[PDB]
Ligand binder design. Structure first.
Ligand SMILES: [Mg+2]
Ligand SMILES: [Mg+2]
Ligand SMILES: [Mg+2]
Ligand SMILES: [Mg+2]
Ligand SMILES: [Mg+2]
Ligand SMILES: [Mg+2]
Ligand SMILES: [Mg+2]
Ligand SMILES: [Mg+2]
Ligand SMILES: [Mg+2]
Lengths: 293, 170, 56, 205, 159, 50
RNA sequence: GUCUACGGCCAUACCACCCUGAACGCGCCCGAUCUCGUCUGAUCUCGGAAGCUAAGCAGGGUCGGGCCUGGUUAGUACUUGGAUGGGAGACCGCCUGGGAAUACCGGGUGCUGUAGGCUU
RNA sequence: CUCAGGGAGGACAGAAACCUCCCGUGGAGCAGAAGGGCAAAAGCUCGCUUGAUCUUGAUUUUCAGUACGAAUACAGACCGU
RNA sequence: UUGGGGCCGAAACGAUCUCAACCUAUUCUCAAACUUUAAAUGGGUAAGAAGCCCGGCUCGCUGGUGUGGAGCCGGGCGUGG
């Protein structure tokens, strides 16, 4: 035959990687540079905005790391958006912007910094960076943790960043990976960015599919017509969502209720059960031979 | 009743012509795949120089293309129309994948242009299941498991069932 | 005319005649070799410690 | 042709094997290490006798071959050519060096390779003969004749193991009959209770 | 004679342990070193910048200067008649908090607590570490069985 | 006399042959009397000996 | 009881095969007008929600391999210091202290930090 | 993005040209001698570049604790990405 | 899984011995320039008043935050650990 690679000597010398690397979730090469602090800063917290886009949700957190594991100081999710007004399309660019705005205003409400550093209330899509007013507490500085998302032009990890820096946080960035940047001429057009902030690219697709074929329209947008979301009112829907987010961004936890404490999985088998099972198997195997021989 | 997430589909169809020289032969052979598929193919170069075959290191040798979607179905049907819907037992691999080779590309149905001439090529069919993107997506890459794998015996049954072909022993 | 190349035979006995003494431990070691930015700011703090004397 | 064995007798230098640094070593004088009826099963040669070194010295490959030839040629005459198995359990891996005096004297006096010896400890088995229980005194006499080809002092010890194995002869037959040992040609395989049960079913079926 | 190379004879000294290669963990990055901390030095071959010399591997010193990625350590060095106080700039991966002073600090806080205690009660509690004394006189109960008689075993030539 | 042993024989104040001294016993003392073991003859004195 | 985002120590966590997954989630999945990128919307990016736990994932199993931790090996091998000990030597014994590692035989098969869910 | 190598397949194609699937803890590669180190990299391929620039001091290595060479932490600038 | 000799097959991954390369569990013997393990002896630090402890002040350094760090003063603890 051919020599088997995964022999006993293969597993004796095998060094596993880290658990998060084995699950694939964490780039430790980027983590070593995103997280650690200069040693002459002496346990000053180094914050980061984690933006993670799942299939049906957008998660925005802000974390700083100690020895025991990093501490989440504020978290904003995209499934909280039906409270604020938008119910359909919780995983697009406009929902990423609303999640970043939630995270920014919710952190400023925790630190008591709502009135100072309002941010860009009337959105334009331009390069906005908050400036620390002297005689006041300084602006919150954090850095984007894009993770393993490929940071090309038009990413929702940068939409959440635009939402945060319009909410009032100081995240250093350039306006190159925002949509509207023309790589042919190296110039950023802010009006195209404002369309993606207000979700007008989805509005054009709904109008396009409505004029092409109503069957493809109902296939692609089933919850839009179920919840009565039309391309003309999405603009004011996202404006009212922004207004409701900046009006009250404080998160109230859902009340935990008492549970009957049922076990859904299987408990681990004990030693005596494992010793008896193999004895029953051997006793069955000898009996099946003396009964068939 | 079988789980419809386990439906055995065609993932991709890989085509190449291995010419072995450089020059206008490669351009004509690439034009064959370009007018056959509708997409431009890509040139494949040599790994290292062997002096008995006339090839050199980093010299362009072959022309290959990959076809996915509903176009691969009709290109594969044009191939098995030439092959009379028969294959051998040795044309199926251990991983559930199968290919064959065709000697005159005109038999596809493509028209003869006197400047290009006659080339043969070979087709390879990469079957798949819904869920095979796990092994090559970037974020959380994982294995495919054992029950979800395609085998030689199950790929032969798929070919005999859907294309109504026959497997002659050899 | 070959001679001896190298040895350390009597050296450990020579070292212990006057003793192998640790360096002179003093309080207030020198700030020479400390990084210039923090050393520059410490001088500014020492320069203005006399400012809040009447409040102290 | 070569120097007497009293020169390269004691284990003075560090071990100096044939490797990518020490090249040009001539071939070892002993190449056949076990011989006789080496294609024999375990249960037919139960008696094992060892020649055991009592000293820490070097044994040359020429002496190893000269001893095993004498042991073979006595045991063939005594018990037949197919009634024994002799195994030399010492391989010559140390390389001794020769500094030829053609007149530079001791300038740059590092030796070129001369031959191969085996570094032998106290209590280490030199050769082992397995045969039936009736050929005990023939094994003792054959090893006593082979002691004269070696420097120093050796002892003769009839082992308590079953042949060329590591299991005791009083319990070997019971441990085979309980299927804890399986014959595997010259030696046996020990079957523990630690594998999957599908091998236990194949064992007991 | 030998060479004067910087990393001569560091083949096993600067090598990683078995099945402990690869990505360096981040807890040795996100821990805090201040001036006066007692630090032992252990060279790691994964990172090559800021490596201590081989004569400081296994030594212990005290931090005097802290930078962005490195700390400065005063290490005692035995040189040929005498001991010098060396000032070396070592990057943070080669650096570990020593636990030798930790037991002394836990004893200092225990001694201060035990001195605040028993001042209002008027008694006297031992604060010095006494060495291991001779054991006190005790009774050994041979309850039931007599002690087992041990004898030397005869020789067996198992060689 | 070895240097480590000379230092312990001076810390026991035994600088001359047939000198005697009283030493209280603990682990730190037994591990020094083990170092100076071939050069001394020590034991447990009687009350009349004291 | 358990999951998700981000982690700490990095196999008690890995590898092979099998079984089961309620709810939320994570996913597979459906598409390419817009952002973006390819020979190929397979990957990446984007817009979704018809179907499905099949796979990934979680839990569990295997007289499982590995790994971790013990016993045996064994006070053995080795070793600090000592003798006007033995031996022709090679080397060995004793006094004084310290003390390993295979084969072989048992047990175990991730703990946990912050934030947010489901089990109302 | 993943290498060395291997297995099973595919016209000419064979030991060895090219395509595809699977296994692959590094068995490859990192200019050279060897050793150490390294896998979403320090390897391979691309895009942009000149931190191979100017300027003080301090430190380590050889060491007399002197130089040269080489090296490590900073600080002041101007930059690249 | 290919071969070195075949042989009954004109022949077929057929009969069917075989010997070597290969594969799989075992086994004998080794390494100054091998190593999963791994001593004895040894090499560094610590075993306090230059330490703990509170309060206040300064900073152009560092920061969401009279945050963090460092330097200054003013006291209190002597069973001298
Ligand atoms: Mg990155
Ligand atoms: Mg001289
Ligand atoms: Mg010598
Ligand atoms: Mg798709
Ligand atoms: Mg699943
Ligand atoms: Mg299932
Ligand atoms: Mg097991
Ligand atoms: Mg948890
Ligand atoms: Mg990279």
């Amino acid at each position: 035959f051919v020599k088997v690679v995964k022999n006993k000597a293969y597993f004796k010398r095998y060094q596993v990687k880290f658990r998060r690397r084995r699950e694939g979730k964490t780039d430790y090469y980027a983590r070593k540079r995103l997280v650690i602090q200069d040693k002459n800063k002496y346990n000053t917290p180094k914050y980061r905005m984690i933006v993670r886009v799942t299939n049906r949700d957008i998660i925005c957190q802000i974390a700083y790391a100690r020895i025991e594991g990093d501490m989440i100081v504020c978290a904003a999710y995209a499934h909280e958006l039906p409270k604020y007004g938008v119910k359909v399309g919780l995983t697009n660019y406009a929902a990423a912007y609303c999640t970043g705005l939630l995270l920014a205003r919710r952190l400023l409400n925790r630190f008591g910094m709502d009135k100072i550093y309002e941010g860009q209330v009337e959105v334009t899509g331009d390069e906005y960076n908050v400036e620390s007013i002297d005689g006041q507490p300084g602006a919150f500085t954090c850095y984007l943790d894009a993770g393993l998302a490929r940071t090309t032009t038009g990413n929702k990890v940068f939409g959440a960043l635009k939402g945060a820096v319009d909410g009032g946080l100081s995240i250093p960035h350039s306006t190159k990976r925002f949509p509207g940047y023309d790589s042919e001429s190296k110039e950023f057009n802010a009006e195209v960015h404002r369309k993606h902030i207000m979700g007008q690219n989805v509005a054009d697709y709904m109008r396009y599919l409505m004029e092409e074929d109503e069957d493809a329209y109902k296939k692609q947008f089933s919850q839009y017509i179920k919840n009565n979301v039309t391309p003309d009112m999405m603009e004011e829907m996202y404006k009212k969502a922004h207004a409701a987010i900046r009006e009250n961004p404080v998160y109230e936890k859902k009340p935990k209720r008492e549970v009957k404490k049922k076990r859904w999985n299987r408990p681990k088998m004990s030693l005596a059960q494992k010793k008896d099972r193999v004895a029953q198997k051997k006793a069955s195997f000898l009996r099946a031979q003396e009964r068939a021989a | 009743k079988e789980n419809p997430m386990r439906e055995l589909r065609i993932r991709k169809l890989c085509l190449n012509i291995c010419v072995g020289e450089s020059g206008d032969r490669l351009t004509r052979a690439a034009k064959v795949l370009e007018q056959l598929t509708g997409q431009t193919p890509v040139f494949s170069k040599a790994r290292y120089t062997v002096r008995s075959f006339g090839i050199r290191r980093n010299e362009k040798i072959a022309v290959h293309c990959t076809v996915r979607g509903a176009k691969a179905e009709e290109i594969l049907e044009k191939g098995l129309k030439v092959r009379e819907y028969e294959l051998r037992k040795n044309n199926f691999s251990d991983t559930g994948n199968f290919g064959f080779g065709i000697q005159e590309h005109i038999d596809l149905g493509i028209k003869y242009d006197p400047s290009i001439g006659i080339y043969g090529l070979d087709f390879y069919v990469v079957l798949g299941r819904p869920g095979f993107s796990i092994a090559d997506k970037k974020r959380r890459t994982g294995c495919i498991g054992a029950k979800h794998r395609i085998s030689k015996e199950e790929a032969m049954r798929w070919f005999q069932q859907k294309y109504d072909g026959i497997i002659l022993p050899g | 005319a070959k001679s001896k190349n190298h040895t350390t035979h009597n050296q450990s006995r020579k070292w212990h005649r006057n003793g192998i003494k640790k360096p002179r431990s003093q309080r207030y070691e020198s700030l020479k070799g400390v990084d210039p930015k923090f050393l520059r700011n410490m001088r500014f703090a020492k320069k203005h410690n006399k400012k809040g004397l009447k409040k102290m | 042709g070569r120097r007497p064995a009293r020169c390269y007798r004691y284990c003075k230098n560090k071990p100096y094997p044939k490797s990518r640094f020490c090249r040009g070593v001539p071939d070892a004088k002993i190449r056949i290490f076990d011989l006789g009826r080496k294609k024999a099963k375990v249960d037919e040669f139960p008696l094992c006798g060892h020649m055991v070194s009592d000293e820490y010295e070097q044994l040359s490959s020429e002496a190893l071959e000269a001893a095993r030839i004498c042991a073979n040629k006595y045991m063939v005459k005594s018990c037949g050519k197919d009634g024994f198995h002799i195994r030399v359990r010492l391989h010559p891996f140390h390389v001794i060096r020769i500094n030829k005096m053609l007149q530079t004297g001791m300038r740059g006096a590092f030796g070129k390779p001369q031959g191969t010896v085996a570094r032998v400890h106290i209590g280490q088995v030199i050769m082992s003969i397995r045969t039936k229980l009736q050929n005990k005194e023939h094994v003792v006499e054959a090893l006593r004749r082979a002691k004269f080809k070696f420097p120093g002092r050796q002892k003769i010890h009839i082992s308590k193991k079953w042949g060329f194995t590591k299991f005791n002869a009083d319990e070997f037959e019971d441990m085979v009959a309980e299927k804890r040992l399986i014959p595997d040609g010259c030696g046996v395989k020990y079957i523990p209770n630690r594998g999957p049960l599908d091998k236990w079913r194949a064992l007991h079926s | 004679t030998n060479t004067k190379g910087k990393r001569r004879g560091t083949r096993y000294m600067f090598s990683r342990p078995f099945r402990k290669h690869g990505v360096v963990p981040l807890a040795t990055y996100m821990r805090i070193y201040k001036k006066g901390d007692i630090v032992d030095i252990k060279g790691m071959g994964t990172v090559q910048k800021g490596m201590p010399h081989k004569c400081y591997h296994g030594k212990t010193g005290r931090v005097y200067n802290v930078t962005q990625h490195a700390v400065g350590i005063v290490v005692n060095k035995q040189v040929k008649g005498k001991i010098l106080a060396k000032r070396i700039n070592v990057r943070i991966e080669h650096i570990k908090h020593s636990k030798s002073r930790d037991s002394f600090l836990k004893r200092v806080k225990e001694n201060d607590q035990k001195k605040k205690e028993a001042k209002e009660k008027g008694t006297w509690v031992q604060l010095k570490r006494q060495p291991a004394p001779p054991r006190e006189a005790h009774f050994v109960r041979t309850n039931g069985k007599e002690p087992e008689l041990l004898e030397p075993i005869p020789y067996e030539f198992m060689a | 006399v070895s240097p480590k042993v000379r230092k312990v024989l001076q810390l026991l104040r035994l600088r001359q042959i047939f000198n005697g001294t009283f030493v209280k016993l603990n682990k730190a003392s037994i591990n020094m009397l083990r170092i100076v073991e071939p050069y001394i003859a020590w034991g447990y004195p009687n009350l009349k000996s004291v």
